Point group: D2
Chain length 380, copies 4
């Protein structure tokens, strides 16, 4: 019924045979056949299907109200599988500030295979309509985006995509199925870096894909079986396990996010704050209309590089590392860590200033995270 209950009881995460209340880990590559072609339970080769992976696939399908789930060895493997629904000569529209790994896969791997790519600012959906070519076959959006949390209208993107015969795809990593369900809004395919919130514990690299479309699912299965970027059984198990606490973790993260944003907006050493909960944020109304909560990623400006480094050194509970969606609160400086290859002037123009800090809020005590960040800001 309700979400926290569905997290526990939705999908197949028990063993029908023994009754084990957790999914067994099928550390196996192949399966006995009783007669040639006769498969006891539908399994014949683990690359094609593995029962632990099938369990996590059913979880993501259930959580996104889809029919089909697919587990990949990483988020970018999920993205690559989805892009491989296209042919040489096909064209993709992506939101212009799409994830660096996504940008790099598309512009440096798949353009060598004749996939044409255009980045457009989808915060105004009519941009999509302008960018559509006769060869356009896919519309790929993250919302909210990294690191400035730009919001894109999911329902309108789905309508545009249906009208123009496009496969619509949403990278729902930042929101998780707990707050935002793109398939409910008309999108064809939803994907996740389960490396982030879903696994939740910084100990799995994994991607998950869900869809309700039987032909898209058949094609995704074929691509998974042929290019073989499958998630292994141990990681599938740890994914199923981490997802159990998704709702509790996201809700704690959200309480902390609200309070941290109040602090940041009040602090003199902080200039701009980027997060879809702020009412002056572009498409705040759209986000509230398509999501029931918030990502834990917040970005904000301090003065310069020296202040950002000082902030990192002075916090006790914000940890300097890559990635997001940990139980630990994570801190980073995009201009130095994710966007350093970009010329300084283009970083400035895009808003990636030297003192732009990104925090990923964890599940520590709210008052501790607020006070720690505030005292560190006070050292500026």
């Amino acid at each position: 019924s309700n979400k926290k209950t569905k997290l526990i009881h939705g999908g197949h995460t028990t063993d029908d045979y023994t009754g084990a209340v957790t999914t067994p880990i099928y550390q196996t590559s192949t399966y006995l056949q009783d007669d040639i072609g006769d498969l006891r339970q539908g399994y014949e080769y683990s690359r094609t299907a593995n029962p632990t992976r099938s369990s996590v696939e059913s979880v993501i399908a259930t959580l996104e109200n889809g029919k089909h789930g697919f587990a990949f060895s990483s988020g970018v493997a999920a993205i690559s599988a989805v892009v491989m629904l296209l042919d040489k000569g096909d064209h993709i529209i992506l939101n212009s500030d799409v994830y660096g790994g996504t940008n790099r896969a598309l512009t440096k791997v798949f353009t060598r295979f004749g996939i044409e790519v255009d980045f457009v600012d989808t915060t105004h959906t009519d941009s999509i309509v302008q960018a559509i070519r006769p060869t356009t076959k896919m519309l790929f959006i993250e919302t909210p985006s990294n690191p400035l949390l730009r919001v894109t209208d999911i329902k309108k993107s789905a309508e545009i995509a249906k009208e123009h015969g496009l496969i619509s795809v949403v990278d729902n990593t930042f929101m998780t199925p707990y707050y935002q369900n793109p398939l409910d809004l008309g999108i064809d395919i939803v994907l996740h870096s389960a490396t982030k919130y879903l696994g939740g514990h910084s100990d799995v690299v994994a991607g998950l894909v869900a869809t309700s479309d039987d032909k898209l699912a058949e094609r995704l299965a074929f691509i998974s079986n042929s290019t073989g970027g499958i998630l292994g059984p141990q990681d599938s198990y740890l994914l199923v396990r981490g997802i159990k606490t998704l709702g509790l973790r996201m809700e704690q993260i959200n309480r902390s996010v609200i309070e941290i944003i109040k602090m940041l907006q009040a602090h003199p050493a902080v200039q701009q704050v980027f997060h879809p909960s702020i009412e002056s944020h572009l498409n705040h109304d759209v986000h509230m209309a398509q999501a029931d909560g918030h990502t834990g990623v917040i970005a904000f400006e301090v003065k310069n590089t020296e202040s950002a480094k000082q902030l990192i050194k002075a916090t006790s509970y914000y940890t300097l590392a890559e990635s997001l969606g940990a139980v630990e609160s994570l801190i980073s400086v995009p201009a130095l860590m994710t966007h350093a290859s970009i010329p300084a002037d283009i970083r400035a123009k895009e808003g990636i200033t030297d003192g732009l800090v990104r925090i990923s809020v964890g599940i520590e005590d709210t008052e501790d995270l607020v006070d720690d960040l505030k005292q560190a800001l006070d050292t500026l």
Copy 2:
């Protein structure tokens, strides 16, 4: 020094920090940075590099006398990564009876990205020379091949590839680094389905790639990081562990292979036997010149489908399942299990008769495997 010693002491499979005599399992996605950019031990994100995966990568690099190792989520993910060294418009020569999954990846995924593919019978290397187009960039060979164990001259293929500016690739799955080292013979890239002999225990799906070429390695690393078909840490650990007994397993398998072949050639219910150890096998001399032993895969003809099914039912120690390189001896009928989509007449023309049986010899007692197969054949 000697191979069985190198299997134990080659590569990095201990923990420098604690002294643990086995590789720790780094079930982790991200790593603390002491200062922005400062990585304690070179790790920053597990998709990019993980220390357990790095350990198995160093093992395969060492075993193939290469400089660089790469671990993928499956053999076909390794193959796909290697194929992605090419661009739209490039052309690949493969041996004509290449592995079904390889055939399907190339002809159904990568041809949609403009990769051009030609299958040629490489048992005569001048066929390669005839097939070379101005657009040809890669030469990809398995030797021996599945299911008829056709042998291709590795050294001559490497020379042809160097002369014509081609990346040469060998799928060394069937022989393993224990018996055949293509990089020693001039090949650019060697790959494996570690799902088979290397893991050895039917409990890992994995691919491994090794090369000595720094620029090819840099490109492979970039492809791995961008398309993300990485092997996870638990599977990397089980791979390192299974490789320890590779030499013992392969040698037992070889003793059994020799004796089983004597039996099969003597038996009246068996027609043709396919294996590179038989002196009348095409390129027997070539195989002996480029390998120090034999694959455990043998194929042989019985009369028809009914005799093949009876053979399977009557053996006590040959197990009906997909895959090869298990500790168990495996048995299959290609015409029904791997080549059933092919019209009957083309199967006959290629030698995939209804009574063509493939066995993958395991590590059971030699006399037991010989006697069991013989008594089952006697029931025909």
Copy 3:
């Protein structure tokens, strides 16, 4: 600082060497020595010490404000290790309704080794004073107890134990270190079945022991190394991982517990309810004084066996299985599952009626758990 923060940042759960933000899994039995006796990082044999186990041991030591942690293969192995601090001829006082496995270990294993056992109702601590013999060496209490949740004054028990030279032990399983810290109240040794709340996900069987006493710790280490009931590295890792969400899980469980108890007290088909939050519960004041929250175990009476079985069948979100502290809400009937060997009349006298139901509240949605249990009760 605050508890939810300490759960994340307390103890050693990262890799100092690589910076991995999670504890590496040292699936290893032995360690290189650089010179005879020279241990790189203090490890020499995994039974004696393993770095993943050491990590979980430091977590439990930190969470209980102790100095020393010990991880065992199960809760009853932890209990057995602690009991083995005694000699033949020594005497133990336990609370009279102690856990069945504990009762059985003491009365059927350790009495054969000359350990003398007396069960006393410790809800009045002067009972302890009466039961003390010249040979008494240990006082062992659970609070609250199973299945009727009897509360024992921890601080007074510790004082009595100090005055009389007794080792005091608390089985803190039901409360967890998140709500109750017996070492802070003078107790010598605190233990847990980490199989329940601490692991939290029904996928580890494990025991944990913490103490601040250096000589007790030395003796426990000696017993662990000699009788060898050690927790393995994979289970230690899953324990560390499950503990991260302990606070979030316990707080959700507590919100649901409060609401479920309101429902149960109002319902006509329910007679008595047993839980330390009810103000008429014996030693309610004591529990509130020594704990900051509540166990998720509740017991309550329906009419008879048929009503209890009907309750189980009619609930959608209460699962029939053994154990407690899952993410799933669990339901059981003690008179049939844990106390069936006891004669019916003695069960009645102890309050284990045929319609005594025990629920272990999970982390499902509060309103769903309340409504589901209520509609099931309405079917009576």
Copy 4:
């Protein structure tokens, strides 16, 4: 039929449900019940029984020709469980040079519980007959023993034990079920540190017990369930996996053992060599009559401590670490590492000289191990 076949096909190591050719890893603590008491497949709580552990238990039962198998968290936990078949006042006869951990468990833990212990030199079985008291209930022998490889007549010990009403126990760690089957010779209980040869890869700490006696098995099950030193599922899986190559590993180890002993007997820097294959070794005939091969543990004398340390430093392929039965060849100096607490004069009297070296032969190349040890000895 034959041993190498039985290693592969004996016991239950597949999944009946899916057909998985390896035992699934049941990382689980509890099991759904369909009705109260109704267990789908006989499982209800993982401490009591776990299906992965049950799989490894069936393997050890099969390999020792017993009926019942038990997996413990370590070898010393197996030993402790077996000793707990006794009561206060009972008496045990052990062989006088029994394993240090065994000696310490008995003389420092179980004597505090009133178990009486006598060490006797069982190389003459009439010593047992002299040592038997009216209170003696158990006879516990290792053969061959550590570090001097003393051999005890198993069949005669079993007869003596039957005549006098004693439970007979053999620690069969050094020989493995591959070469020596004490239950076939009348012994009641056989146990192993599976930490050594059976796991075989230095990555599991585990104990295994097998018996054919239904009442002894019932008592062992009760002790396991009450004191809880159970092996976890991941370690049970790695045990099942390592056992597959037991025969191949032991046979390689034996070839190397024969050749190394020839070298050692010929070398001038080596005095005495201890191994049951040497024909002048005490009870050589007995060992050959009760075993089909040899342990990989060899001990031999060099001049002094300085020569032993030099030997260790000069070998390339002998690794200094604790434990035995690795794939690596291990080297140690008992007088410094396992027997250092013993006064020097008593070490001399027992034969534990300062230059007594113990090697545990691994699976490296035979010629490499011989040559490496010989060149190191030549540096003396």
